[PDB]
Design an enzyme around this catalytic site. Sequence first.
Site, PDB file in Angstrom:
ATOM      1  N   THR G   1     -14.282  12.660  48.434  1.00 38.33           N
ATOM      2  CA  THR G   1     -15.139  11.442  48.427  1.00 38.33           C
ATOM      3  C   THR G   1     -14.633  10.446  47.394  1.00 38.33           C
ATOM      4  OG1 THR G   1     -17.150  12.602  49.159  1.00 38.33           O
ATOM      5  CG2 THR G   1     -17.462  10.504  47.969  1.00 38.33           C
ATOM      6  N   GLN G   2     -14.471   9.197  47.819  1.00 40.18           N
ATOM      7  CA  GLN G   2     -14.095   8.118  46.916  1.00 40.18           C
ATOM      8  C   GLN G   2     -14.902   6.867  47.247  1.00 40.18           C
ATOM      9  OE1 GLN G   2     -12.740   8.599  49.825  1.00 40.18           O
ATOM     10  NE2 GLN G   2     -10.489   8.570  49.763  1.00 40.18           N
TER      11      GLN G   2
END
Lengths: 231, 240, 212, 235, 222, 195, 233, 244
Positions: G1-2
């Site tokens: 996740t970014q």
Amino acid sequence: NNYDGDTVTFSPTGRLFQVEYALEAIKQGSVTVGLRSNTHAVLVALKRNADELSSYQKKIIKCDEHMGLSLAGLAPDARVLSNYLRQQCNYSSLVFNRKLAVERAGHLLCDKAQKNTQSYGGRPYGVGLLIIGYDKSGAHLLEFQPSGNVTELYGTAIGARSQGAKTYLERTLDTFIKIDGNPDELIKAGVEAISQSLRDESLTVDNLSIAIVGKDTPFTIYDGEAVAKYI
Amino acid sequence: GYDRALSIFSPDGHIFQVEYALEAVKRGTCAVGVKGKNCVVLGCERRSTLKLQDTRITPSKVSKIDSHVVLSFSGLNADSRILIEKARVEAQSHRLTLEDPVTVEYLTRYVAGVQQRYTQSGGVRPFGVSTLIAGFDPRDDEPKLYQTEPSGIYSSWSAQTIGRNSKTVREFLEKNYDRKEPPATVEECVKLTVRSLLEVVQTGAKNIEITVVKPDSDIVALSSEEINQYVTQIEQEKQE
Amino acid sequence: TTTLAFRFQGGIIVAVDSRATAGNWVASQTVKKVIEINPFLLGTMAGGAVDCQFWETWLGSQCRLHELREKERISVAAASKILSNLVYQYKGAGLSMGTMICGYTRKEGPTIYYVDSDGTRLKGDIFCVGSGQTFAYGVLDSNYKWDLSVEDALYLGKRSILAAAHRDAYSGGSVNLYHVTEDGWIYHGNHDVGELFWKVKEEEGSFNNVIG
Amino acid sequence: DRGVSTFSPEGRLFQVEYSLEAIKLGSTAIGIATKEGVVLGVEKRATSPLLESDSIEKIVEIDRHIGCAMSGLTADARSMIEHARTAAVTHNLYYDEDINVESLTQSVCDLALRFGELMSRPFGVALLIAGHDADDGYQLFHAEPSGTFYRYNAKAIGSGSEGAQAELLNEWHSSLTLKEAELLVLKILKQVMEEKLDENNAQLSCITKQDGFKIYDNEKTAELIKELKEKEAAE
Amino acid sequence: QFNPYGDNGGTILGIAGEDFAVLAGDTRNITDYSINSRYEPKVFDCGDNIVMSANGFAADGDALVKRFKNSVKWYHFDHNDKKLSINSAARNIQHLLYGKRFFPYYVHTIIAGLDEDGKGAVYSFDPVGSYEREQCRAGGAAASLIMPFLDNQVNFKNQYEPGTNGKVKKPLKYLSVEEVIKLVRDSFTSATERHIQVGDGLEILIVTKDGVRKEFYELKRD
Amino acid sequence: MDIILGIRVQDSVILASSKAVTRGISVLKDSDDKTRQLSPHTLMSFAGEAGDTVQFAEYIQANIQLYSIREDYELSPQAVSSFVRQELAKSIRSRRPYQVNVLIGGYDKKKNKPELYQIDYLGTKVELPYGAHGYSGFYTFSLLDHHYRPDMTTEEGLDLLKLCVQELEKRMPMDFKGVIVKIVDKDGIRQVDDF
Amino acid sequence: TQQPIVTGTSVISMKYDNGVIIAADNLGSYGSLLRFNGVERLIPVGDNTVVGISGDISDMQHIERLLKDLVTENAYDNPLADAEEALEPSYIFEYLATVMYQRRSKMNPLWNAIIVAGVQSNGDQFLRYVNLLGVTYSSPTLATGFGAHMANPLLRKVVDRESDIPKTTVQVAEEAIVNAMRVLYYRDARSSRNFSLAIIDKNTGLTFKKNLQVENMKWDFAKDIKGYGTQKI
Amino acid sequence: GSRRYDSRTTIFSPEGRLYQVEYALESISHAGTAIGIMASDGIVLAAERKVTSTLLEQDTSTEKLYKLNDKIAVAVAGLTADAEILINTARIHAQNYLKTYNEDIPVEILVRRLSDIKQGYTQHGGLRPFGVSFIYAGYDDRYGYQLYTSNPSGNYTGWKAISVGANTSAAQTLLQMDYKDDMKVDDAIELALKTLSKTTDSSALTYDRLEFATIRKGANDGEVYQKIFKPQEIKDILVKTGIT
Ligand SMILES: *[B]([O])([O])[C]([C][C]([C])[C])[N]C(=O)[C]([C]C1=[C][C]=[C][C]=[C]1)[N]C(=O)C1=[C]N=[C][C]=N1
Ligand SMILES: [Mg+2]
Ligand SMILES: [Mg+2]
Ligand SMILES: [Mg+2]
């Protein structure tokens, strides 16, 4: 002699005896013939039985809707290699929505067999394969040897007494290549080719095994009364 | 890891390492198993080459796997401990998951499976041990006596012997044991077991061990004096 | 969900409802909440539909493998413990199960085990599991005896599910009856609550609250 | 020494060929396939009279529709049977159906060549796998340690194999009944066995579509032995 | 935070006849209040006379169908070109779905075809693999609108015979393929009216012993 | 589960443990035995999170029974309690700890003394004359502080235990459906069938 | 996740009678900052495919390298790399679509919305969408981000269904695309005036147009607009 | 490949013997003799250092007698380096048992553990066995005073009196002749030294060629004391018994 204990050892003349002994297992195997035209590609295989009570060992394996092979030698090794081809054909379809090229299928088999000839502990494959297929560049026929050598051909034969069928195809080269849009005549030429490798025994209904792939023909195998037409 | 294939086939279709493991069993002290009508007895030879031994603490030949099953053996002593330990663990594991103690057949099948595994695993040699596994299934009064060997084969026996000079005592048991009427009592069964060992043992002093197993986890090992009384009675009848 | 099972003279009665919901939405009225593990073992299903299904048909595979290996029918104790030990490995992961493992063997007689996704394994004579369990318990406890006829026991189980089907919003559809003896289980039909309610009301004189 | 997966100059795996020699030393097992069922029979060959012969388990159930007989180093067969049973049950779990006899046999034969320097040597046991499915009906397979399996109408493996196979060559026809097959296995077993054939040193079994796989009682086999003696004395 | 799930809308419908089965589904594909495609096929022929649709999150739906089609292919390889029966397909799909029990395929799967006796069959699945053979099942966005209509018009629920007044039920007479298609079309026309994620087009796959046939109908595009 | 008590008298250890098994809303069972015999002269009662309690108890039982067979010898109550403590002390820093509290009542045949050990799920061991887990101690320790004399007979111990159970039945909100009482002495373990 | 950092906005596209058109502006935004003004977001693969990418630019550059590497790999042991066994739009898409879905399944997505536009071997138009979730769909018109909301309505007035494709010429189609780009410049606060446009025709091949600008803009009417209601001056 | 050079340390001979175990035992037969004698009130451990030198620092030297814990000690016969590997493992096992059960490890359990380790090297791993034989002298409250021996095979046995290393045949005969069950420690001390004095390959038995130890309940009240004898203390006991 002293240099045949394992695959990792060259002989003084630069030979790999374990590979050559694996090659010998193919010559002991039952004859199988491969040939193609521009539209279709045909496999013909003489199946072998243990005795009269036994069944006739299956020689032809389907890899995809557009590709398959016939075997000669250790059948379990053919199962391992055909399974690998099935996976590679399948990876090409799922990931790239692309039917695997017959030439690329040969390259993959070559590289798989090679790793077994250079490493300690393992052994070479003890089987020869004839791969036929129809892809974006038309009909194809390959010959696989467990040394790793793969060769694209118009026609060929491997197994015991395969030299007779191979000579016939070498004479008939100009005829059978032109058999376009006629599957039955191309099979006839294949059945007539494999007949040159027969001695004592002849082609019966449960002896003969034929497969075909082409332009509008999925890879299909014919056994039993389906090949009585060609006897 | 060490992966070397030690147990392999020979041109004549033999696995020599397994067969040489049987030769180790042939060397081992004699062990005998006899099942009566309502009991099983396990007899074991103690070679008297070793005196000045402490018999209190010296590893006994018959080992309890559970409260209802026992295991004796012939062959390499150190190897037998590994099989006994695994068997004892599996006995507790079986009680834990199935909520019922092992049957004598199941325990035998497990031990035999371990022995077999060591005949086609890389880097290991076979166990130089044959076992006699005896006992009574839970809530069952039918006696059980099984034998195993290095190859991994096992089978049930009315009576059986293993180890050195086992050929002689098997000869004795084959003529003296009647299937239609087995040793009806504990006395008769122990007497027949001691008699069979006396064919081979030498002196009937501290060279014979006897262990009686009865139904419902009733296992007891006879003392020197109790066995000596059997030895005395057998020879007094023989003087005739 | 309402499922019950109770031991008695004639063996075991197993009775279940048929409803499956997703929130207030009735997803199905025709759910088979009883698994036929073999001709002698039954499992009930409550909580997560798939967890119960998947792992109870899996249980049947383990029971079949046991009797292939041991040449003997698996005990209800052993079968229930295979399932409880399995779900215990998954403890914390979020499995949702409330099950009765019901069977008869020679050594045990009629036996019921409550097995639970929290790892609880309990042997007992009477169990009710599901959102409508409390309703079923009321009828069962006031009418239960060891000396019931197979006919009367079957009706009590049917009636106890009906009681819960009525009151519990997440129970209903129909009633599946099973009767477990020492020659195996015997199915006793699917009973639609929409017809069973009016039948029982009329014949029994119960549910005087409701107008029919 | 030399590799375990080494090829001979003739193009054969040494270890596979040597394991076949071990199988020749094994006790005789015979299978006969008919349209009414498949029959499996074995020689028990107890090493001593004190050995309780009913504990000799050389015929084994894989599933309700598949049975199995063995010959050779029978201890090696246990893991093959375990795999077969697991494969059969696992397939039923994944597909809610019985597994094809050929597919079961193929699964067993995949283990065969998983040896090297995986297990340290090939299996020293041959199997006769008999069963029934809806697609190909009653079937009999011969599974070797080479990884190869042949289907057979009838087959004998073990010490008296080539003598028994020659006898099966003459006797088998496509219209054999189950009763005829039972007697035929008993007849040929009695011929090749060292000791005299009776219900204690020989075992029968069959697989039918209705009743599935069944090992015969010693009382049931004893009658078939008595029925055999009388019909041979009849001419 | 990254959300690995999405909702592509749509609605599907399976109905099992006496010797046939239909699996219908609208062709609209959406995110939020936007249309992605007015014609994005959702119901697929998977071979062996089986049709399938995995409605909900289209990426998981496409992945599942792709993996099942793959499973059919390998079933042929591994078991001598044996036909995968609808019941066997259903059990295989349960394991595919449960394999991702703790990170589910966010879809509502339905398959349709013929059982081994030649009768019509529909199987229904939840996202985590629980399944059940049914005569009738709607799935997806407008499933709540359609199912009650099917309880009434396919299984004749709450319907009785005139004159008897609640005593005698309406008999469960079988429906023809022409009769089923009428109910399917009326279900989707009604669902389109009251559900914003349903519309554009309706594609029906009909399965008989003769094979798989397709029919397409226009739906309102608002 | 709920209430487990222990009291060590002159020549024995007495363990009382509730019979109720309540799962949220309903009391599923009223005859549950929350104890396992680890060895002929050692008994362990237990209470904690569902599933974990029995799984742990049976795991300990199996290990002690394994030891007993291997050495043909019964471990002392002190030794068993130390083994149990280590398992829980190992457990508390695991991925998913055993949520189980136990009482180990044993009779040491070597020293001819009864012994009672209280161990919580953290692996906190103490030897006591009388012990309890959960909310039980809050009511019972005051009574035991007053009445316990260390030369008590087994019958006096049971009477003092009845006074504990009566107080619990009066003041605790939960209906624990009475207790199963078990005595551990030189002759082994036996259950008081009328309490 | 970014989280996406440097981002590209709308990619718009449509089919026409002989091929496909695709377009995307040359901006790399850094939040509200219009940081990079020379970013090419249309990346050609061979002479028959153009991949238009929106979203995270670092992930775009990663995808660009995968496609570059894909061409290299396809040429290996392939005598027909520039003929029968050349990369197809359908091959390139399915590869990306596989990667996108795999990455989302590992909870580490390539934060992009991708449109693969091209022409197949048999002359068929190829136009399909894929995004960070692995969601795929095809349509006569496709657009990402703001384009979905504003471009599609305009492009669908030209090609509303499949039967409108043969009736739409390249001049009409390009005109519609260029108009849509203008509308996006009026209304998308993260767009730029400069853009690139690519045409893949089955007859004339790949035409790649750089340094295009939005022109013929209406702003004159702004002079008449005063205050927010009551103000007259 | 590598197979060519593999000795195959864990195989049977045709006779059913373990080659490497047999050859390890041959190695041990050349080691300095070690003797253990168990009495009713204690245990004696006596051992002969191998052909020493005058320049060897004896008082800080240890090649034969080692301490495993406060209750258990061992006498070594064979490769000293091999023995120290096993000794450190044994010391740890005793501490593991103490930490787990809060009780000192029973002698037999410690002996079985070390013997199982030795066994492992004869059945798997392809490594050579430990060329070591131990005499375990220990005490616990179950069996009291105990003597055991283990050898490279991993087989162990209990004894009243026992010898390992060189001249065990001659040593065991002498012990079997003069040993009695009602014997005491002071008498056992004398027997151990007399046996070594007769079986030694040296010209004379002196203090500088010996290691000596006793495990006695000769500790103030119900407890056990280990006494590793100092060079001067060995010299005194040699005079006391009348050997020098
Ligand atoms: B029952 O209500 O517990 C029932 C039993 C199950 C085997 C069908 N469970 C459900 O209805 C659950 C929801 C639920 C309601 C009340 C208590 C616990 C659980 N439903 C599902 O699991 C489900 C499965 N597929 C579709 C819809 N719902
Ligand atoms: Mg309700
Ligand atoms: Mg709209
Ligand atoms: Mg505490």
